[PDB]
């Protein structure tokens with residue numbers, strides 16, 4: 001029996017709506033749940049789902065200590081990590097990512113019927129406020145980026161004691177829905193919001209490219225099996241059936 | 252010093268146009284050449300480029316024997332494989348792919364100003380001929396697919412002794428440019444053709460999703476370092492600079 005760490009995030013992992021209390025893996029539903037069931041079908045294993053204790057994805061502090069699911073894997077406290085976990089330079093040095101089961105990039109969430117079309121328009125303007133979720137991967141991108149426009153936008157974001165940032169995605173969506181605010185976030189979620197908020201839309205394309213990968217500890221025997229299984233589901237179109245299932249309109 | 256097997260394909264690996272003979276790595280230019288230089292910058296190694304002898308990518312025959320670059324890596328005849336090599340189920344069981352340095356999918360190459368808009372439009376019709384390169388990965392997808400539309404299209408393609416298929420991509424491009432033909436192929440090439448053939452365009456989106464990865468033999472010490480370096484170039488935007496360099500054309504009206 002394997003242990004699978006994960007985090008709550010629509011529509012990947014959500015508390016299932018039921019009248020009676022639920023127990024174990026039956027407590028959760030979502031894209032990553034279906035993906036985990038298919039993984040258990042291919043590789044043939046039993047799995048127990050455990051939300052990450054501190055509710056964090058995975059970053060390292062100044063002394064080099066990791067948190068969240070990444071740390072769960074490093075300490076051999078979880079066997080798998082099935083969640084929208086971004087494949088980054090620093091994360092892959094400490095854990096093993098499978099081949100990406102979803103490809104995406106940073107984009108812009110804003111209102112419809114406006115003249116804004118790119119991040120350069122946001123950079124050339126200070127009336128509309130723009131920012132991202134604190135400590136998320138997008139913030140890390142703008143922090144580390146050396147592209148001119150993105151260093152300017154990071155200056156605006158960090159400015160005023162980082163007042164332009166939000167603690168979580170839903171607070172950012174609300175800030176867009178109530179003020180003159182643009183929220184830079186991962187595009188797979190922008191699809192969800194836009195498909196469920198017909199007055200919001202994505203502005204521009206993808207600023208970069210990245211992917212969600214299943215995480216395993218370094219030296220795990222299930223590494224190759226997980227990668228091969230992910231590719232097997234990719235070529236069968238199953239992953240796209242799942243995404244289309246959990247994501248589907250707007251005029 | 253490492254040995255890197257590869258294959259010729261615009262704009263990944265092309266013979267540079269010169270008046271005088273060229274020698275060694277100076278013979279070649281392209282996207283994968285720039286990527287290989289940056290990789291050598293990160294990991295710090297010397298490399299020698301070797302075109303794959305049989306000029307094949309990598310497939311297995313009826314008895315289970317591999318050819319092309321894949322076989323080059325399996326037999327420890329190459330250290331790296333830097334080429335538009337698709338990360339497939341059957342290939343990863345025998346070699347190690349890095350994280351993809353380019354993501355793409357199967358799409359349709361056709362003419363502009365026509366009513367065709369999706370693979371469903373092609374599937375409902377037998378007047379317009381459509382197909383793909385024989386034994387390639389694009390053909391393999393339609394071979395294995397269990398979706399209704401793609402099983403229908405596979406019937407049309409295989410029909411008439413596979414008369415709808417072509418031997419290579421360039422013959423397919425010519426077939427589109429001269430007859431009423433649609434060529435299903437990897438989208439990264441459709442972008443190149445469309446940028447250099449302003450009367451051709453891509454029809455629809457991506458039928459599937461896949462990626463090009465640097466190939467190494469199983470158990471190579473350069474594996475993790477190559478993957479990490481590829482991700483480092485992804486986060487620096489270098490891969491997009493290279494693609495935009497080798498893909499932008501002179502524009503279309």
Ligand SMILES: O=C(O)c1ccccc1O[C@H]1CN[C@H](C(=O)O)C1
Pocket residue numbers: 057058084085086087132133136137138139169184185186189
């Ligand atoms: O970071 C965001 O902007 C974001 C906005 C909405 C929803 C999810 C977001 O990212 C999460 C999931 N991937 C990031 C990681 O792998 O660390 C963190």
Ligand SMILES: O=C(O)c1ccccc1O[C@H]1CN[C@H](C(=O)O)C1
Pocket residue numbers: 260308309335336337384387388389390420435436437440
């Ligand atoms: O097959 C195609 O659609 C194609 C069209 C133009 C150029 C190259 C093409 O395929 C090569 C590259 N990817 C395939 C592989 O890595 O297995 C073989």
Ligand SMILES: [Cl-]
Pocket residue numbers: 100101102103234460461
């Ligand atoms: Cl994908």
Ligand SMILES: [Cl-]
Pocket residue numbers: 209351352353354485490
């Ligand atoms: Cl990429």
